[PDB]
Design a protein around this ligand. Structure first.
Ligand SMILES: Nc1nc2c(ncn2[C@@H]2O[C@H](COP(=O)(O)OP(=O)(O)O)[C@@H](O)[C@H]2O)c(=O)[nH]1
Ligand SMILES: Nc1nc2c(ncn2[C@@H]2O[C@H](COP(=O)(O)OP(=O)(O)O)[C@@H](O)[C@H]2O)c(=O)[nH]1
Lengths: 370, 369
């Protein structure tokens, strides 16, 4: 099962580039797309090496980079341009689709901060559900007239994208000043590319459990509505050190409340005899709170680092606190609704997200059923 | 068994002149008709070396080309003048026939869109009179134009024992999509790639398909459904090539099902994963065939010329070729309501309707009777 990526706007093409650098570094792949001398299945992302990239100004500098051999501002205008090149761009997708053995998903790297890609992102997801109804789509959207373009794409992402990994630049810059002391764009993305790289540690390296993209998502997302995730990455030393440093709100990449499911990926060679002990100490101290209705647990799996390149770890969670972020956005909309052909699509968009904000607040009650 | 080819009209000359150039280089033959020193069977098309061609103001363009030592617009004008030189051009074909050991076919290259239309209609009629046992394959090219086009189809549906369609419209797309031309001097380069790779099994002898009648009788089941379309992917295993040939993006054509498929693999691919891919194509069901008769897919390998990497060509007998006719049939009636007997056009009109009905009847589970 092969995976293919799409990068839109200025943001998606930037972080996706460094995502291609860091991933190409994990394997023994020279910048010139040639294997050097110097186990790891490199066929899911690379096709004989050629990466399955689809890039939609900065592209000129991208080819000017040493990795050349590796291949308006409104929302409606971003949606219009996507319609003007409907068939022209789509041929690239189809020829890459069936030319591949068995497509599994569609990784989408894009921003919703008022860019032409933000609309461009809204269009592709509509058609991706039109043509291929049996193909999962994952999107690593990133959060910041900015209220407008933000709340609109949320209307499409809640019914087309079967998964989503949110990344807000606000909580990122807090990490930038504190533990890197920058006071730039190419500076914060250094850590962002790290999150995505380790996010697919269980895919590029074979393991027992979770050997496919449906193996990770099916456990966390309980319903096609509550389909929002957050990430964590602690190394910036035993197992009880990792999981305890992950649950802190100082590390989460997000600006009652409880968890639904957690996933912790350990990449080190740590002694696996103590992984159950760390699970006991986290329970007894009661450092995290779960749902009361159904039995919700925390899962951990192991894998191995790139031998070419120390204990790392990733935390993936579905927290109902993500509802607060939306409330920050939609509140700005009502304020911009009273201050400034039909303006009816903006109505149903505001309408459908307010159903989602109702769906989260209802999950925290012991009687969420019915 | 030798195959004497014919070239009519500006189209037939240009494709044939560039067909020979593709063949002369694929063998160790200098344009001076002299073998270069630098196994491949070359007697079918060449006579010990001279090509067996009978051409018919572009001729001067060939006589000035470095290959000089190798040899109106009405359909009625083509059929009329062809009758005035009945004895002239048949003197050449006859003297070229008996000089050959045992004649096998007449590969005729002409475009149905000026004089090549009316003259070719005359030849395909006259050949069946004198030569009743000679196959007549034609590499016809699809584009008053609706008139001259369909009139040739009257003859091409009862005389030509085979026909390979190559429409300029679908070619122009591939010229624009993957070549970005915007020219005749470029699209013919693709045509010459299709014509040369079509007879790769005759010039390179293998297990089977050592004669033209071996490639014909396999695909064409009945004397009427004798229209074939082509597919050429290289513009890597056998599964990579087989999957690309069945995509509608590669076919040179602008319910529906196949009748017979022949795959030509000109690579050095080991002959062990040939059955595995065919096994896989059946599983994923990338193509469907006729329900009435047993239809199977055939694959053939060959060897690339060392004097000149995996390629692939597919000979297809698809029912969707009936669509190209309807476009001609449609525009005819429009010109029939817009303006010594004018009966030949109506008689030709009837027989084309019999053909299209036969195609749409071929996709029925009761095509028999
Ligand atoms: N997280 C992150 N966001 C970025 C980066 N570069 C640009 N952005 C976001 O992209 C937005 C600008 O979009 P822009 O490039 O003008 O859209 P385009 O011109 O249509 O591609 C800003 O609001 C930024 O928040 C980056 O390196 N990291
Ligand atoms: N594919 C292809 N078709 C051609 C080329 N040259 C001419 N044709 C076709 O031939 C037709 C014109 O035929 P024409 O030369 O007038 O015939 P003539 O009256 O006997 O000279 C046009 O409709 C074209 O479609 C060529 O180089 N390639």
């Amino acid at each position: 099962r092969e995976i293919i990526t799409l990068q839109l706007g200025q943001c998606g093409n930037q972080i996706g580039f460094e995502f291609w650098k860091q991933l190409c570094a994990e394997h023994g792949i020279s910048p010139e797309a040639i294997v050097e001398e110097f186990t790891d299945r490199k066929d899911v992302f690379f096709y004989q090496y050629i990466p399955r990239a689809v890039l939609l100004r900065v592209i000129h500098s991208i080819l000017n980079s040493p990795y050349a051999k590796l291949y308006g501002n409104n929302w409606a205008s971003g949606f219009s341009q996507g319609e003007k090149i409907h068939e022209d761009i789509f041929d690239i997708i189809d020829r890459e689709a069936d030319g591949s053995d068995s497509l599994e998903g569609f990784v989408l790297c894009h921003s919703i901060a008022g860019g032409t890609g933000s609309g461009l992102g809204s269009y592709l997801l509509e058609r991706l559900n039109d043509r291929y109804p049996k193909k999962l789509v994952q999107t690593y959207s990133v959060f910041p007239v900015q209220p407008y373009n933000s709340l609109l794409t949320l209307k499409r992402l809640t019914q087309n994208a079967d998964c989503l990994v949110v990344l807000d630049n606000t909580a990122l810059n807090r990490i930038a000043t504190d533990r890197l002391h920058i006071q730039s764009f190419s500076q914060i993305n250094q850590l962002v590319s790290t999150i995505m790289s380790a996010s697919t540690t269980t895919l590029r390296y074979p393991g027992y459990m979770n050997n496919d993209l449906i193996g990770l998502i099916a456990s966390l997302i309980p319903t096609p509505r509550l389909h929002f995730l957050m990430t964590g990455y602690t190394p910036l030393t035993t197992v009880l050190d990792v999981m305890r440093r992950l649950l802190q709100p100082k590390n989460v990449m997000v600006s009652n409340h409880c968890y639904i499911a957690i996933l912790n990926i350990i990449q080190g060679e740590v002694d696996p005899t103590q992984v159950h002990k760390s699970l006991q100490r986290i329970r007894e101290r009661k450092l995290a709170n779960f749902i009361p209705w159904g039995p919700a647990s925390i899962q951990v799996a192991l894998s191995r680092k790139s031998p070419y390149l120390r204990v790392s770890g990733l935390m993936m969670a579905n927290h109902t606190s993500i509802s607060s972020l939306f409330e920050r956005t939609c509140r700005q909309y009502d304020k911009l609704r009273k201050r400034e052909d039909n303006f009816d699509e903006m109505d149903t968009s505001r309408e459908i997200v307010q159903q989602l904000i109702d769906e989260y607040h209802a999950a925290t009650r012991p009687d969420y059923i019915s």
